[PDB]
Design a protein around this ligand. Structure first.
Ligand SMILES: [Mg+2]
Ligand SMILES: [Mg+2]
Ligand SMILES: [Mg+2]
Ligand SMILES: [Mg+2]
Lengths: 95, 99, 132, 95, 64, 197, 243
RNA sequence: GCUAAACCUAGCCCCAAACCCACUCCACCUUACUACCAGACAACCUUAGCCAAACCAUUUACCCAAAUAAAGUAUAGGCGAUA
RNA sequence: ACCUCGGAGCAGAACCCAACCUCCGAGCAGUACAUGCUAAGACUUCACCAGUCAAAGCGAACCUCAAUUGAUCCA
C-alpha cells in the first residue's frame, strides 16, 4: 500500500490500523472485539464480557498489518505507567 | 606517475559573495557566521558580541517565555487548587452516597 | 554590543565533557572475580595449539543466533590457531549433557564455530577456567 | 468586505518559505459579511451650530451616512484628531 | 584523520553524490534539487515520468 | 550494567556521574528526537552492587535508591527538556554552533509533584527531608544507614547543579570556543539577570 | 543541459543588468521589499503559537493570505484593500456535497473625495472599508500618505501619493494663490510625510514607465566628433604653447 | 552467377562548468517580406479531466527557493482509498 | 421467483456435502433483576469476522424456547 511516495520515496502507514490495533515487540497484535458497545441489552453477560476482553491476531493478518504499517510502529518503546511492558517481551517460548 | 595532491578542505572560513543570487541565503544569515566562528576560532574576523541576541530578540523571548512557561509559585498554587477541588468533589459525592 | 569579557580557566570542565575514542584498559581490581561476572584473561596465556582472543570490550567472543525463528545456536567467533582441537574439546565437553555429540560447524577461514542449542554460559565458563 | 476561512487545513510551512497550496485549499467558506454587522456612530467636531446636534467647538457622535454626506463635504465639521481637539479645548478654556 | 568522506570525492551531478535510488527517487530528487533550472520539455516529461512511475510502482505487479 | 561499567573502568566513580558521562561511556544511547525525556533506574542488579557513586538521573526506583544508599552513593533526579537533553547527550555539536548555553526549563504541568517529592529524590525537594526518606528506606529494607559526612569525598558526593544549569562548571549565557580555546561571558546586565533567572 | 540560474531569478537579473540597472537604489529597494499586506478577507491568528482544543499541546500557526483578484477598474478607482474573491464552496456547507464555483464581489459606491493639498474633488468608486479606514486615519490625505503601497493597491492612489509628495517636497506657491498662510499651515500639518524631490518623483511607478523616464533622461543628441576633436586639439595647442 | 551482403563515419545522448541571442544595402502587420496620408481599437479571471477509490457523487501526490534527519511522526480524510 | 437464520429427508451408521430439490418455521415472546465481576480448559457452521460451554474464586441465595437477527465510520 503506497510503496513509494512522491515527496520522499518511502513507504507510508495507514492510520486505520494504528487507531484499531496495537503491536507488541514480540510481533503480536491485539484488538478490541467487535460489537462491544452495541446491542448490549440482548447480549448475555458472558457474550458481552467475551466482546469486552482483548484478543490477539493470527499470523497471516499479523504479517499483513506489519506490511501495512512501517517500522516506526514496530520499534521498542519505554513508556511510563504503560501496563504492557510485561507483554512487549516474550517468556518461555519453544518451537 | 606523480600522484595528484590529496584533496583537502578550503583552509579558513568560506565567506561567499553576498551580491550573488545563486548563493543561498543561510550563509549570509548570522547563524552561518556563528558556525564559522565556533569552527575556525577567532580567525574568522567575526565580532564575538554579535553571537548573543540583540535586545529586540531579548524582549521577544522574555515576553513569550513569561506567557507560556509559568513560574514555580504559579505551578504549585495551580496544583494546590486542583487537588483541593478534587478533594471537594470526592467529599461531597461520598457524603451524598452516605446519606 | 555587549562588553564580552573572556576567560580560559573553566576549560577543564569542557575537556571533561569531551568524550574518549579508545576503550580504557580496566583497572587492576585487588580481588577477582570482579562483580557482574567479569574476569580478565590469564597471563601468560596457556601454550596450546590454539587461542581465543577477547573483543573490543574485553569480553569473550561467544555469541548467540536465532535463525528461521527456530534454529537456536551459539557461535565462537575469533579463535586463533587449531580450531579442530577446540571443536573436539567442546564435543567431548558437551556430549554428556545431550547424550549426543554436537553437530558443530567450523569455518576455519574466519575461524568460527557455529553450534546447535544455547550453551553460552557453559562455554564462557569453560573458556574462563582455561584462561582465554 | 466579506470574510472567509479555508474549509481544509493548510500544511504548516517555514517562515522563510511560502506555503504549498492546492485546490483543496482554494475551497473556502464564508464566516461574516461585515455589512450586516451593527453600525457604531463616529465622533466628530462641529464648527457651525446645527439643529439638535451641537454648536461650535462641540464634539458629538453621529451617523456615518450623515457625516460623509453633508457635514464633511460642506466643510462644516472635522474629525476629532489630537491636533485639532487640542485647540478646541484651548478655545473652550478661553471661553 | 577523517578530514573528508570519500563521497564528496566523486565528480558528477549535484543530485547524485553519495546517494543511490531507483527511478522514482532519482527523478523526485532531480526535480526537488535542480528542478528550477530544468528546461520546459525536460521538466514536463520528468513530471509525466514520475506520475506514471507513481501509479506503476503503487498499483502494478505481484505482491499485493 | 552500571556495575559492569564501573568495573570496565570507562566511567569513573571518583567524579560525579552524569548523563553526559554515561553517554560518553556509551552506557546508554539516546534518541531525543524520539522524545525520550531521560533515563530510568531499574530494580535489576540491586544485588552484587558496590558502586558508591554519586549518580544523577531523571527517574529512579526505590529499590535502586536503597541499594545505592546502602553502598553509600547518592541519588539525584533532574528533569530536562528535549532540546536540553539532546545538547546534553551531544554537547560538542552545539559548541560547534557557538550559541550560548541555554538555561534549563522547569518540569511541565505534571512532573512537578514528582521532582518536588523527597522520596523520589527530587532536586526541588528540600534537603532537610532527605535524611527522613533515607531513614524510612533503611528501616524498610533492613540495612544500616552509613552517614557519609565522614568520608573525604563527601564534597564530590554532594556536588550538585542548581536548576537552570546544565553542567557543574558552566552556566547559562556562557559561551565556549574550542579553536583558540576560550570561554566568554556577556557582562551585559540584562543578559546576566536573564540567564540567572 | 541546464541553466546557470533558476527561472525565478531572471526578472531581477534583468533588473540588475540593462537600462534599469542605472535606476536609483531606493526604487529598486521599494521593488525588492516584499512587504506583507494588511489582511481584510480573513481574521489572522493573534499569536504564532496556539493550544488546540483537541490535545493539550503547542502547535505553530501561520496565517495565509487569500489570492485576491484585482480588475483594472480597481486600479483606476480606489476600492481599498479588497477585491474580487475567486474560489469554490460546498452546497449547504456540507463536505459530503458538490463543490461549486463561487465569486465574492464587494459592494462599490461612487462617492466624492476632496483634498485641500491638491485642491480638487474627485469622483471614485470606493467601499465602506475604505471610508472606515480613512475615518480612523482622521483625514484623506493622511490615509493616502500613511498607507502601505500594497494595502493601497491602486495606481490612482499611488499617483496621488506621487503628486502629494512632489508638492510637499517642492513647497510650491502653485497650490495657494494669495494664501501663503494657509499654504504654510497645510505644509506644517503634512511636514512629516515629506521626502526628497527625486524620491517623490520616482515613487509610484512600475518598471516600464520607470525605464521610460530613465530613457527620456538619458536621451540626447551625441556630441559631434568634430566638436570633441576641436576641444582636444585646442587643449594640445595650449599645451604646446606652454612648452 | 545474379539479385544481394559486409563496413564507419557523419553525428547524437547524459552530466559538469559557463549565462544567452541579435546586416546597421532595400522590404516585411494592406493579401506579411508591398517606397509614401487624418484611426482613436486595445491584456490583466480558481485550470479541468482521465485515473485510483475495484461503481461514483467528498476526496485522489504533480514541486518553487539547504541535501540528509526528525518523519512518512503530529495532523487531515465517504477517519477509506489516500494526502 | 429468490437473496439472512433455524429444524427434517436426500446425507440410513464420527464430521462435512449441493440443485430455481422435497417439507416446516423464525425477524418474537414469558419470568427475574447477582440477566453481577472475574477465571483454568475446550468447541466452533469448513478462512477471518463472528458464534458457543464452563470448572474455580469474590460477592450472593438457601433463566425457558429452535431460528427469534446486523460489522466499521458517524450521530
Ligand atoms: Mg544473526
Ligand atoms: Mg470530483
Ligand atoms: Mg473454524
Ligand atoms: Mg461457579
Amino acid at each position: 500500500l503506497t510503496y513509494f511516495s512522491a515527496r520522499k520515496g518511502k513507504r507510508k502507514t495507514v492510520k486505520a490500523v494504528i487507531d484499531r490495533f496495537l503491536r507488541l515487540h514480540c510481533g503480536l497484535w491485539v484488538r478490541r472485539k467487535a460489537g462491544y458497545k452495541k446491542k448490549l441489552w440482548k447480549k448475555t453477560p458472558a457474550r458481552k464480557k467475551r466482546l469486552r476482553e482483548f484478543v490477539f491476531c493470527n499470523k497471516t493478518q499479523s504479517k499483513l498489518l506489519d506490511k501495512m504499517t512501517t517500522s516506526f510502529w514496530k520499534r521498542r518503546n519505554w513508556y511510563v505507567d504503560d501496563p504492557y511492558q510485561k507483554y512487549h517481551d516474550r517468556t518461555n517460548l519453544k518451537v | 606517475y606523480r600522484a595528484r595532491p590529496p584533496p583537502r578542505r578550503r583552509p579558513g572560513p568560506r565567506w561567499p559573495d553576498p551580491e550573488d543570487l545563486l548563493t543561498p541565503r543561510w550563509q549570509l544569515g548570522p547563524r552561518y557566521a556563528a558556525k564559522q566562528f565556533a569552527r575556525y576560532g577567532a580567525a574568522s574576523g567575526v565580532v564575538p558580541g554579535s553571537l548573543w541576541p540583540s535586545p529586540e530578540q531579548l524582549r521577544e523571548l522574555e515576553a513569550e517565555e513569561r506567557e507560556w512557561y509559568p513560574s514555580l509559585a504559579t505551578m504549585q498554587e495551580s496544583l494546590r487548587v486542583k487537588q483541593l477541588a478534587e478533594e471537594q468533589k470526592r467529599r461531597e459525592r461520598e457524603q451524598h452516597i452516605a446519606e | 554590543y555587549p562588553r564580552f569579557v573572556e576567560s580560559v580557566d573553566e576549560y577543564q570542565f569542557v575537556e571533561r565533557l569531551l568524550p574518549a575514542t579508545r576503550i580504557p584498559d580496566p583497572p587492576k581490581h585487588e580481588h577477582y572475580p570482579t562483580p557482574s561476572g567479569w574476569q580478565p584473561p590469564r597471563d601468560p596465556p596457556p601454550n596450546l595449539p590454539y587461542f581465543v582472543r577477547r573483543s573490543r570490550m574485553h569480553n569473550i567472543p561467544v555469541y548467540k543466533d536465532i535463525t528461521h525463528g527456530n534454529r537456536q545456536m551459539t557461535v565462537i567467533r575469533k579463535v586463533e590457531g587449531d580450531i579442530w582441537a577446540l571443536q573436539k574439546d567442546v564435543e567431548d565437553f558437551l556430549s554428556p549433557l545431550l547424550g549426543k555429540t554436537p553437530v558443530t560447524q567450523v569455518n576455519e577461514v574466519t575461524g568460527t564455530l557455529r553450534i546447535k542449542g544455547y550453551f553460552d554460559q557453559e562455554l564462557k565458563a569453560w573458556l574462563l577456567e582455561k584462561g582465554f | 468586505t466579506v470574510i472567509v476561512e479555508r474549509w481544509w487545513k493548510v500544511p504548516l510551512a517555514g517562515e522563510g518559505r511560502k506555503p504549498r497550496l492546492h485546490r483543496r485549499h482554494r475551497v473556502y467558506k464564508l464566516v461574516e459579511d461585515t455589512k450586516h454587522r451593527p453600525k457604531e456612530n463616529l465622533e466628530l467636531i462641529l464648527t457651525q451650530s446645527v439643529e439638535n446636534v451641537g454648536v461650535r467647538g462641540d464634539l458629538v457622535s453621529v451617523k456615518k451616512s450623515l457625516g460623509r454626506n453633508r457635514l464633511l463635504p460642506q466643510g462644516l465639521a472635522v474629525y476629532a484628531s489630537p491636533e485639532n481637539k487640542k485647540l478646541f479645548e484651548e478655545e473652550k478654556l478661553l471661553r | 584523520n577523517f578530514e573528508k568522506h570519500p563521497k564528496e570525492l566523486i565528480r558528477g551531478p549535484i543530485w547524485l553524490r553519495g546517494w543511490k535510488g531507483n527511478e522514482l527517487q532519482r527523478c523526485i530528487r532531480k526535480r526537488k534539487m535542480v528542478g528550477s533550472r530544468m528546461f520546459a520539455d525536460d521538466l514536463h516529461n520528468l513530471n509525466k515520468r514520475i506520475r506514471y512511475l507513481y501509479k506503476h510502482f503503487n498499483r502494478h505487479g505481484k505482491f499485493r | 550494567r552500571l556495575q559492569y561499567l564501573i568495573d570496565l573502568g570507562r566511567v569513573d566513580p571518583s567524579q560525579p556521574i552524569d548523563l553526559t558521562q554515561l553517554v560518553n561511556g556509551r552506557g546508554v544511547t539516546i534518541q531525543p528526537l524520539k522524545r525520550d525525556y531521560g533515563v530510568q533506574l531499574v530494580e535489576e542488579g540491586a544485588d552484587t552492587f558496590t558502586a558508591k557513586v554519586n549518580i544523577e538521573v531523571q527517574l529512579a526506583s526505590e529499590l535502586a535508591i536503597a541499594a545505592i544508599e546502602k553502598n553509600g552513593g547518592v541519588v539525584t533526579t533532574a528533569f530536562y527538556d528535549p532540546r536540553s537533553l539532546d545538547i546534553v547527550c551531544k554537547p560538542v555539536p552545539f559548541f560547534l554552533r557557538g550559541q550560548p548555553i541555554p538555561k534549563r526549563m522547569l518540569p511541565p504541568e505534571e512532573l512537578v509533584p514528582y521532582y518536588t517529592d523527597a522520596k523520589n529524590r527530587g532536586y526541588l525537594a528540600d534537603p532537610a527531608k532527605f535524611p527522613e526518606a533515607r531513614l524510612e528506606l533503611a528501616r524498610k529494607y533492613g540495612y544500616i544507614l552509613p552517614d557519609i559526612t565522614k568520608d573525604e569525598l563527601f564534597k564530590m558526593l554532594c556536588t550538585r547543579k542548581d536548576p537552570r544549569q546544565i553542567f557543574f562548571g558552566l552556566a547559562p549565557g556562557w559561551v565556549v570556543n574550542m579553536a583558540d580555546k576560550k570561554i566568554l561571558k556577556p557582562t551585559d546586565e540584562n543578559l546576566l539577570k536573564y540567564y540567572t533567572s | 543541459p541546464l541553466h546557470k540560474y533558476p527561472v525565478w531569478l531572471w526578472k531581477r537579473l534583468q533588473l540588475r543588468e540593462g537600462i534599469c540597472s542605472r535606476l536609483p537604489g531606493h526604487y529598486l529597494r521599494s521593488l525588492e521589499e516584499e512587504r506583507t499586506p494588511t489582511p481584510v478577507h480573513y481574521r489572522p491568528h493573534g499569536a504564532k503559537f496556539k493550544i488546540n482544543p483537541k490535545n493539550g499541546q503547542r502547535e505553530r500557526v501561520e496565517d495565509v493570505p487569500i489570492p485576491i483578484y484585482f480588475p483594472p477598474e480597481s486600479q483606476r478607482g480606489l476600492w481599498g484593500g479588497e477585491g474580487w474573491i475567486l474560489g469554490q464552496i460546498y452546497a449547504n456547507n456540507d463536505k459530503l456535497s458538490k463543490r461549486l464555483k463561487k465569486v465574492w464581489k464587494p459592494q462599490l459606491f461612487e462617492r466624492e473625495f476632496y483634498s485641500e493639498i491638491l485642491d480638487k474633488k474627485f469622483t471614485v468608486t470606493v467601499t465602506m472599508r475604505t471610508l472606515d479606514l480613512i475615518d480612523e486615519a482622521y483625514g484623506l490625505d493622511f490615509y493616502i500618505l500613511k498607507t502601505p503601497k500594497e494595502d493601497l493597491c491602486s495606481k490612482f492612489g499611488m499617483d496621488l501619493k506621487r503628486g502629494m509628495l512632489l508638492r510637499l517636497a517642492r513647497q510650491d506657491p502653485q497650490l495657494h494663490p494669495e494664501d501663503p498662510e494657509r499654504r504654510a499651515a497645510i505644509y506644517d500639518k503634512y511636514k512629516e510625510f515629506a521626502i526628497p524631490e527625486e524620491e517623490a518623483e520616482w515613487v509610484g511607478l512600475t518598471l516600464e514607465e520607470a525605464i521610460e523616464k530613465q530613457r527620456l533622461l538619458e536621451e540626447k543628441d551625441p556630441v559631434p566628433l568634430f566638436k570633441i576633436y576641436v576641444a582636444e586639439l585646442i587643449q594640445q595647442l595650449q599645451q604646446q604653447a606652454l612648452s
